[PDB]
């Protein structure tokens, strides 16, 4: 019912299946023990449900390259078995799959660092070393170099990145190159560098193999490209000999958001649109397509002739063949949080993801059918007792799952409600489709006792967390509402509000009491306008000249924490700036090293760099953390029965969604 999404692309010289890329994405296994056989059967299985194009993560072509210290490299031919064993595992399965060829310039985590001139990066510790003309020239055929291994290792092509803010984009910007050089001043020396490490490629790989570029056709920071650069350099690279031109949005150091769940769905198609016709290549638009309809409308709407969807691959390798077969549904959708993703590549981890643990661990994780069935019983249907319930089930085991509330979901129902959070909606359609698919017998309005129901061979605690109830003098005070109240009971709150408790709920529920009104994560020109992007890419980076436009917000809030650090230091590391700056553009204020005296008539007493405060606020919400709840741990082990604990009534500390849903994958799996 897509039927633009699953029409061929004819390329001259070969057909992709379908108008799907898997966009690029560094895993982590590149430069892992086992990465080749696990990278291997992580890509396989998305090429046997239907993605047309595989890219690959980004690889260094030489050594100055790489992300970090031993990071993933192709510049040996002894790589080769490495690479063949990845992509013979996709054809065997009837796909495609590119390498993407990637030198991260000025924000590879190395002192060795190379860049188009000697400036520091704002998120990088290390001063590059202005590379030299003839170390250029090296450069540009060791990308030749490794688009040859590449070939021989049995790649369908090659993708050159040309965007992010990594080496060749930061050639064309006069925002990181000062170079007099003839690979700097005017335009044509700055496109230079990347129009020869393209045409120096396709020489090297003759006309029969796949070159994508990915353009960057929106910087989005400070003295970027213009939207004529951009399609001069388009036009440019056509000539060069790409195959397909790909988009790339915004820069790491850029300040405004490009793939957080706050960015609304198809955001950038708009982009990707107004180069239509200025090039004949076909054209793939990206970021944040998480969905059949979106990509499909996407196409049919004629934004681009190509639609990429990188993490919604992680989330579920089997997104097109359920679309494909009407089983939209069934799809486990990606809600963009990048906790298990991007925020652990970052760190140096292997990825994963929040809703589907699997990801990239298919092989060390195998779903095996069931070293025996058994009866059990779930307590509790948040993120864990669902990620258990239909995985266990899926194995063969009979489930019963239990929960007191009139719907699945657990505090994923407080979650979706948070502006900017509501692809969470998604997840609970996804398990409450799965508990049918799987045969899970749903139960719900049902608060289970030790007693109540425990005929079963086993029992799995997944009840969940306790707020934690301060123990503040005067804190029964009418002033003060929990984080469930003002969330989940809409409790009424005043103008004037303190928040009690930094960190991920505090967060949420100050982004929830300082709404302006409707959410930008819905409305792209809206988002556009909020964070200040020029909707005629005109302006250098796509800026806008009057800056960002984010709302006042209609209460004034005080955000308060003991610890002296930053607030918000905790919060996920790709995201935690954005919630950030958008708080305080609305106003909001945030203090550390705080100490709570009462709370009385007078508001809130509290003591400041050592100087007392009486802040005159209408509510105090408490946002400080959760410990587990635990009501049937002991009066189920106190009565001989066998009984496990995942999720929140096992650790409530850092335990959020990812681990709960890891866990309860994990023991189902086991079970
Ligand atoms: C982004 C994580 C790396 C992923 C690498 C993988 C490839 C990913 C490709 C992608 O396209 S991902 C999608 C697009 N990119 C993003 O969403 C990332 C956006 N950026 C971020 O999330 C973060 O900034 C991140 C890079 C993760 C972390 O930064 P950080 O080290 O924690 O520092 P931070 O907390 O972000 O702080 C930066 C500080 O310096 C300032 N700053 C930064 N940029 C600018 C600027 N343009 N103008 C002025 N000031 C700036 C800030 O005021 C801030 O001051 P402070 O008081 O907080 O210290 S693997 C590559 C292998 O070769
Ligand atoms: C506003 C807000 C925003 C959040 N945002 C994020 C985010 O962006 N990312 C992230 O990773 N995490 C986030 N979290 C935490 C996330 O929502 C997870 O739900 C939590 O980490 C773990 O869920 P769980 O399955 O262990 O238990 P829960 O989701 O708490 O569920 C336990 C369930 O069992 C039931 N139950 C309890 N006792 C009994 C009994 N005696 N009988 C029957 N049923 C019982 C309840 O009905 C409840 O639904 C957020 C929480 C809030 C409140
Ligand atoms: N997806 C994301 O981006 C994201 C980001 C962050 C967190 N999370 C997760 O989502 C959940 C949200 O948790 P949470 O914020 O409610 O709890 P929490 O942040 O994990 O911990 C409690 C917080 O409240 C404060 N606090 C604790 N005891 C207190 C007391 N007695 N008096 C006053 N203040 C106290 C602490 O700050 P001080 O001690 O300094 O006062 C601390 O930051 C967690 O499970 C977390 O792991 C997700
Ligand atoms: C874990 C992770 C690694 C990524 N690695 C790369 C990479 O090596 N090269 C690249 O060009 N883009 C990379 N990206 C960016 C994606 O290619 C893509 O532009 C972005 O995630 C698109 O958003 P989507 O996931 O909503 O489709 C990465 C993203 C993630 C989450
Ligand atoms: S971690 Fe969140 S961002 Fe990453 S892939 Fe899974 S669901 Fe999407
Ligand atoms: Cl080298
Ligand atoms: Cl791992
Ligand atoms: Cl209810």
Redesign the pocket.
């Given at each position: 019912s897509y039927p633009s999404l699953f029409a061929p692309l004819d390329l001259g010289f070969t057909t992709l299946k379908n108008r799907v890329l898997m966009?690029?994405?560094?895993t982590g296994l590149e430069e892992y023990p086992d990465g080749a056989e696990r990278l291997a059967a992580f890509y396989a299985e998305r090429a046997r449900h239907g993605v047309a194009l595989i890219v690959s993560?980004?690889i260094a072509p030489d050594l100055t390259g790489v992300g970090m210290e031993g990071g993933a490299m192709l510049n040996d031919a002894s790589q080769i078995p490495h690479h063949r064993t990845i992509t013979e595992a996709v054809h065997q399965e009837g796909g495609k799959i590119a390498l993407?060829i990637?030198h991260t310039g000025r924000y590879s985590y190395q002192p060795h660092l190379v860049a188009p001139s000697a400036l520091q990066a704002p998120i990088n510790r290390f001063v590059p070393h202005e590379l030299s003309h003839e170390e250029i020239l090296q450069l540009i055929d060791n990308f030749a170099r490794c688009a040859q291994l590449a070939r021989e290792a049995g790649y369908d092509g090659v993708e050159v990145?040309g965007s992010?803010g990594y080496l060749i984009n930061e050639f064309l910007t006069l925002r990181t190159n000062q170079r007099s050089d003839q690979w700097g001043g005017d335009y044509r020396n700055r496109m230079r560098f990347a129009v020869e490490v393209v045409r120096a490629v396709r020489e090297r790989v003759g006309n029969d193999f796949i070159i994508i570029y990915?353009l960057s056709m929106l910087d989005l920071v400070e003295d970027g490209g213009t939207f004529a650069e951009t399609v001069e350099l388009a036009q440019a690279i056509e000539a060069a000999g790409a195959t397909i031109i790909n988009t790339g949005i915004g820069w790491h150091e850029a300040r405004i958001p490009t793939?957080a769940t706050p960015v609304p769905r198809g955001a950038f198609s708009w982009v990707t649109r107004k180069l239509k016709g200025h090039v004949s290549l076909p054209l793939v638009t990206?970021?944040?397509?998480?969905d059949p309809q979106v990509a499909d409308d996407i196409l049919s709407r004629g934004d681009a002739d190509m639609v990429?969807?990188?993490?919604?691959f992680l989330a579920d390798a089997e997104l097109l063949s359920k679309a494909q077969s009407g089983r939209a549904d069934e799809i486990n959708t990606?809600i963009?949080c990048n906790q298990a993703?991007?925020d652990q590549?970052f760190v140096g981890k292997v990825?994963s993801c929040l809703v589907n643990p699997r990801a990239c661990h298919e092989t060390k994780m195998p779903i095996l059918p069931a070293v025996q069935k058994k009866n059990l019983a779930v307590v509790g249907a948040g993120p864990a007792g669902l990620a258990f319930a239909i995985n266990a089930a899926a194995r063969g085991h009979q489930v019963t799952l239990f929960d007191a509330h009139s719907e699945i979901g657990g505090q994923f129902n407080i979650a979706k409600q948070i502006p900017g959070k509501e692809e969470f909606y998604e997840t609970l359609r996804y398990y409450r489709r799965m508990i049918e698919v799987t045969g899970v017998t749903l139960k719900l309005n049902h608060t289970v006792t030790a007693d109540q129901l425990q005929a079963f061979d086993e029992t799995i605690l997944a009840s969940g967390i306790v707020p934690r109830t301060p123990p503040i003098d005067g804190i029964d005070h009418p002033k003060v509402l929990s984080y469930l109240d003002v969330l989940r009971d809409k409790a009424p709150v005043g103008n004037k509000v303190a928040i009690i408790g930094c960190g991920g709920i505090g967060f949420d529920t100050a982004m929830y009491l300082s709404q302006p009104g409707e959410s930008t994560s819905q409305n792209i020109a809206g988002f556009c306008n909020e964070w200040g992007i020029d909707s005629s890419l005109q302006q250098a980076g796509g800026l806008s000249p009057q800056g960002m436009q984010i709302p006042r917000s209609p209460r004034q809030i005080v955000m308060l924490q003991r610890k002296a650090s930053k607030p918000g230091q905790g919060l996920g590391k790709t995201t935690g700036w954005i919630h950030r700056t958008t708080l305080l553009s609305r106003g909001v204020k945030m203090i550390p090293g705080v100490s709570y005296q009462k709370i009385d008539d007078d508001g809130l007493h509290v003591v400041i760099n050592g100087e007392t405060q009486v802040l005159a606020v209408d509510n105090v919400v408490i946002c400080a953390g959760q410990e587990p709840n635990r009501a049937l741990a002991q009066p189920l082990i106190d009565s001989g029965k066998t009984v496990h604990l995942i999720g929140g009534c096992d650790v409530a500390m850092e335990l959020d969604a990812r681990r709960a849903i890891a866990q309860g994958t994990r023991l189902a799996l086991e079970i």
């Open positions: 966009g690029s994405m560094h993560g980004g993407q990637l990145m992010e990915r793939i990206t970021n944040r397509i998480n990429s969807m990188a993490r919604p990606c963009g993703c991007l590549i990825t």
